[PDB]
Every structure is written in structure tokens, then in C-alpha cells.
Amino acid sequence: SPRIVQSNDLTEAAYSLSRDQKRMLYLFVDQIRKSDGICEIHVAKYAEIFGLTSAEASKDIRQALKSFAGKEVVFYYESFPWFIKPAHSPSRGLYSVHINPYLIPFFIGRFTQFRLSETKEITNPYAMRLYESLCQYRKPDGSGIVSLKIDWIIERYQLPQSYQRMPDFRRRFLQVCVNEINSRTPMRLSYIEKKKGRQTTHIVFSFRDI
Template sequence: MANALKKKINVKQSNELTEAAYHLSLKAKRVLWLCLMQTYFTDEDESANPVFTVAVSDYEDIFNVTRNQASRDVKEGVFELSRSSIIFYPKSGRHDVIARPWLTEAGGRSSKGLWEIEFNHKVLPYLYVLGNQFTTYSLRDCGSLKNPRTVRLYESLCQFRSSQIWVTSHDWLSERFMLPDSQKANLAELKRTFLEPALRQINDKTPLSVSYQAESSGKLIFNIHQKQ
């Protein structure tokens, strides 16, 4: 993947994955990104391979950390993914909420700095995006964001770049971002300790310029603009 990485460091993420409920640490999220990057270069007529190879050297190069740090981060990120589940909210079918484990198996070759990660086959369709319901963004644009929930907010905002407005709710953010109880219970606390610091980071470090309004009803309205 190294040659591809030099050309373009983009992630293509399905809207279902963006809207799912999960909370991963930054290390695990970065490992997931390294897998999503590989689907970006997949042709639509290729079959979806459940096994992804994650190289410590790619993590080191993209996220600008030492080799030792990259090795530790990838290992911890892979182990976290192996323990974690993701919750989907399908718009049709028998269930309106489904929980699935991310991985089937993960194996590492320490001497080569490589991990082979096999995703749950029921999660796989959300990783390989072959339709038009997806969002593309660059890791160069958001790689400096250090808080995993700020990253998730950025991904959600990117989904609505073309319309320039995203209307959501306190309850939706609480559920999908798995926010702590203090932020779930109190909109003012959510604004003070999550939304406002997160938007300062996004406005400072990414190509987006975002403002928002919070209504007493719990509705949140984000105005999204691309910086010139």
C-alpha cells in the first residue's frame, strides 16, 4: 500500500458506518482508517476481501510517530477492535438496531511489523462502499485531531458538506457517539465539554469552518462551509 499512500491519503466511509454507534480510542480508529484506505483503491468489480494487512510503517509515516510508538499503537488498536462491537441502525429489514463485533480474527507478525485483520463478514459491506451513499475525506485534513469523538464529529460534518447544513439532536449524538452520562443528561454540559472544544479544533485544523445553534428542544443545527 505504500506507493498508493504517497499519492493520496483518502478514506471512503459509508454513511451507515458514519451514522453507526461506537466509540473507539484514537489508536483503534487509526487502525480502522488504515483498513478503510485500502477499500478506497478497490475497483467496484473486485470481490470484498475480509482480510486487511496493516503495516506499522504506514501508521508511523501517516501519523508522524516513532516506530516504537507506532508498533505499540497498532497492537493496542487491533486488540481494542477485537474486543469491540459496532451498532447499526438499518432503515429496513427485521431489526431497527443490530450489534455486531468488528473482527473475526487478528494476527500479527512482529518481526515484519504487519498485522492481518479479518473483519466480521456482516460488517464487511459497510467497509466496502460500492454504491453512492458514502463520504470521502482526507487523513491529511483530520489527522491532527487527537480526540476520537472530535474525529467522529468531523466525519459526520463531512457527510453534509454539499448541503452545508446538518440538523441533528442531543439524543442522536448521545446515542451514536456513546457520550458520557454527564453530557447525555445536560445539553449545556455537552456544549461546554464536547461541542465547543471540538468545533474549535475542527475550525483550526481542518478545511471546514463550522458554526452551530443549540435549541432548548435539544435540536442542533450545524452550518458547514469549506474554507477557501
């Protein structure tokens, strides 16, 4: 199945994208890498890849696409827009898109890689971003260990402000996303909290392959 590879600069960039937008983003990165920035998406191809109907596929592409306008990317800093022209459909069931050509070197570079089947069942976009960043530290054999700082998680993934209250961080982001990964990917994930005084400062993740 398709092998995603991506620069670590993208794995650790600051942005806010939905699940549907990240799914499309994987195919753009795949298309670009297999080579001006103009990519293409076929409704019927998207539907088969993610086990959707043609109807529900069309709805996902259309709304994702019009929601890209105004979206930006920050590499730690420098900010860029994803698109430099609105999307448009030349043919029925087919969409044409214009990626910011200045993003090309950030896609292809110290790199991260995973098969697309590993992620196509994750629903929460924050849970996707976590699985990508763990992959960045994965070994050939399938294990790894990493400590991520809570302030850095909040900035890079752009979690909403009420998750600055730690019990909400635990309840609505950490537990759910560890649970999706353990239920929806071939990984098996555990964690422990590092504290300093009263504040929790980092989360230490350990994982292996099933």
C-alpha cells in the same frame, strides 16, 4: 493523498472507538475498498503517515489492536463484532488482522468522502466523528448546513453518561470539538442551539471551506 469513502451507514453507526483505532480503521476501509476481510498494517508505513516515531507507532498499533476484542457495531437494529479472530504478527513490524466479512457491505454501498489529510491532526475521537458526519452533508463547493438531535448524538457517538447533563455536554464535548475542527482541519465551523421550552433538543451546524 488517500481518499476515504464510506457508506453513510458507517458514518451513522453506533460504536465507541479510540483515535488510534479510528486511524487504523481508515486504512482498513481503504484497503478493503481497493478490491475476505484480511488486511495488513506496516509499522513503518503508519509512522510516516501520522508523523510518529517507529517506537511510538508500535505502541499505538499494539494497544489499539488488543482493545478491539469484544468491541461491537450497531446499525440502526443489528450488532456485529469488528474482528472474528485475534490479531497476530507474522513478521517483525507487520500485523495481520481478520475483519468480520459481514461488515464489507456496510463499508461499500448515498455515501461520505473526505481526504485523509483533513482529519490526521484531530486528537479527540468524538471530534473525528463530528467531522465525518458534517462531511456527509457537504457540497462540492465546500459548504453545508445540518441539524443533529442531541439524543441521536449521544447514542450514535456513545458519549459517556455525565454528558446527559447539558452544561457538561457543552463544556467537555461541543466547545472542544468545534475548536479542534476550527484549529486542525481546513473547515470553519459555527453553531446555534435549538430549544423547546427549557430543553435544548438539537444543534444546528453551519460550515464553509477555507
